[PDB]
Design a protein around this ligand. Structure first.
Ligand SMILES: NC(=O)c1ccc[n+]([C@@H]2O[C@H](COP(=O)([O-])OP(=O)(O)OC[C@H]3O[C@@H](n4cnc5c(N)ncnc54)[C@H](OP(=O)(O)O)[C@@H]3O)[C@@H](O)[C@H]2O)c1
Length: 313
């Protein structure tokens, strides 16, 4: 298992990264410092997470310490839905760059295919509770992303939470200049995504699997929900390999040629989650894990289900 995957922009991306959604601002600086100290070279970020300044403190301190060189890091962020306007994309990217302490991003993603009315609120609502859309379509947002490459702000551009038809719409864009490098989607044994993964990979788009552990800290978790980390069938595969259940859940997408971005702010778990390059799941293990699919989503985008570009109908 090589540590990096080749993207369609010619750059290499580490297949394991650290997630930062829900990482508290008072804990994420140490989390990222620990991650870099124990070997992580890829950090997954977003403006909507409200913690990029604190992530950036860690990155900048490890660069200053010469623990790593900038060229050895792969930093990802995402354009939030309220910035799908031609005239707002550059400033949104620059705010992320300034918060992260960087002069370029390795990868910048359209966070969701749904554009919302610009303003201070990340989910602008009508008086009846529906998100207020923007009329800017995703192809015009893509053209704005392409400009960022041509201005040197980002090395690669991609998409997130795009369905098969939405990926195809960009690939078929008249005058397309840069193909998406990555589609970042939810993926784990309860949402195995065979169809969408096959399509993206067949087009040379690398897939990143988010919520690989089933996001046990998601804010809307309910006791009756299925739990990957507590599934006895997955625990049994882990026991057979003398690994933890989390380590199996991280290795699983790696063996599907995916990038994977488990989140932790716990130093011991950050280290545990990196120790996944020294064992191999069998083909039978892989097929068994795939068999657990039930089309269950952590991230249903429930605050934007009324938007015309909602991806999960
Ligand atoms: N593009 C998108 O729309 C999108 C959506 C969702 C997620 N993402 C990205 O994907 C990342 C990962 O997804 P996620 O944050 O939803 O969840 P996740 O990585 O599936 O799970 C994170 C949870 O698992 C716990 N955990 C981590 N390692 C563990 C271990 N070894 N043993 C036991 N528990 C462990 C963490 O606890 P502690 O932190 O307390 O240790 C946290 O509660 C996000 O942080 C974000 O970067 C992107």
């Amino acid at each position: 298992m090589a540590s990096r995957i080749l993207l369609n922009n010619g750059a290499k991306m580490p297949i394991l990264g650290l997630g930062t959604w829900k990482s508290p601002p008072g804990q994420v600086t140490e989390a990222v410092k620990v991650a870099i100290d124990v070997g992580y070279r890829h950090i997954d970020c977003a403006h909507v997470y409200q913690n990029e300044n604190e992530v950036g403190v860690a990155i900048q301190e490890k660069l200053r310490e010469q623990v790593v060189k900038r060229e050895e890091l792969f930093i990802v962020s995402k354009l939030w839905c309220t910035y799908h306007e031609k005239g707002l994309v550059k400033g949104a990217c620059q705010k992320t760059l300034s918060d992260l302490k960087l002069d370029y991003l390795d990868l910048y993603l359209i966070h969701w295919p749904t554009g919302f009315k610009p303003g201070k609120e990340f989910f602008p609502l009508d008086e009846s509770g529906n998100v207020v859309p923007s009329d800017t379509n995703i192809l015009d947002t893509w053209a704005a992303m392409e400009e960022l490459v041509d201005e040197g702000l980002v090395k690669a551009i991609g998409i997130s939470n795009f369905n098969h038809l939405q990926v195809e719409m960009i690939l078929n864009k008249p005058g397309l200049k840069y193909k998406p490098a990555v589609n970042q989607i939810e993926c784990h044994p309860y949402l195995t995504q065979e169809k969408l993964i096959q399509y993206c990979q067949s087009k040379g788009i690398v897939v990143t699997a988010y919520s690989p552990l089933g996001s046990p800290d998601r804010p809307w978790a309910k006791p009756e929900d299925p739990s990957l980390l507590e599934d006895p069938r997955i625990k049994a595969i882990a026991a057979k390999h003398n690994k933890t259940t989390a380590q199996v859940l991280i290795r699983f997408p790696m063996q599907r040629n995916l990038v994977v971005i488990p989140k932790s702010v716990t130093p011991e778990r950050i280290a545990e989650n990196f120790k996944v390059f020294d064992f191999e799941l069998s083909s039978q293990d892989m097929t068994t894990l795939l068999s657990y699919n039930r089309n269950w989503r952590v991230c249903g985008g429930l605050s934007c289900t009324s938007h015309k570009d909602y991806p999960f109908h």
